[PDB]
């Protein structure tokens, strides 16, 4: 129907939503945004993951957890939280037009950007959408609160 702020809040509250996936790789990037920049990284990383696969090396199996806390990359085997990126540290979400089961995002403070390339167990789109809605909700709430303080 309509994903209202309330629905979205209830969805990303606490543990939020969780997706099965694999970590294609991590790459240092020059800027916070950019389709081309993101594509170049994804391509380089997939190139590397491929070379690894031809030698019996597979991508780390993970859980991409999406919530108000941002993104948590969790190891599927140990349950160890490998990475955690607060919403205010994720600057760009990159769609991978060459793959229906891959996407990436840039995170880090200014001047220290990293591209996390992800291979989704299922389709990537529903995941990219969630992230979009998440950023959207966080945004709406903050905006209201502001108009209230004023």
């Amino acid at each position: 129907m309509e994903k209202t702020d309330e629905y979205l809040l209830a969805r990303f509250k606490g543990d939020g939503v969780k997706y099965k996936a694999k970590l294609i790789g991590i790459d240092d990037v020059p800027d916070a945004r950019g389709d081309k920049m993101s594509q170049d990284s994804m391509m380089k990383l997939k190139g590397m993951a491929a070379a690894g696969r031809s030698q019996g090396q597979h991508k780390q199996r993970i859980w991409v957890n999406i919530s108000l806390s941002g993104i948590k990359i969790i190891d599927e085997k140990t349950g160890v939280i490998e990475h955690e990126h607060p919403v205010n540290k994720i600057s760009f979400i990159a769609r991978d037009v060459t793959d229906n089961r891959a996407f990436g995002y840039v995170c880090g403070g200014e001047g220290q950007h990293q591209f996390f390339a992800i291979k989704t167990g299922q389709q990537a789109e529903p995941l990219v959408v969630d992230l979009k809605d998440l950023f959207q909700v966080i945004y709406n709430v903050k905006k209201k609160e502001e108009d209230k303080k004023k």
Binding site: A32, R33, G34, D35, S38, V87, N88, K89, I90, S91, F92, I93, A94, R95, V97, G109, E110, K132, F135, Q136, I138, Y139, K142
Partner: peptide, 9 residues
């Protein structure tokens, strides 16, 4: 395609 986070930084 790709998109940025309004609340980044």
């Amino acid at each position: 395609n790709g998109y940025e986070n309004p609340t980044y930084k």
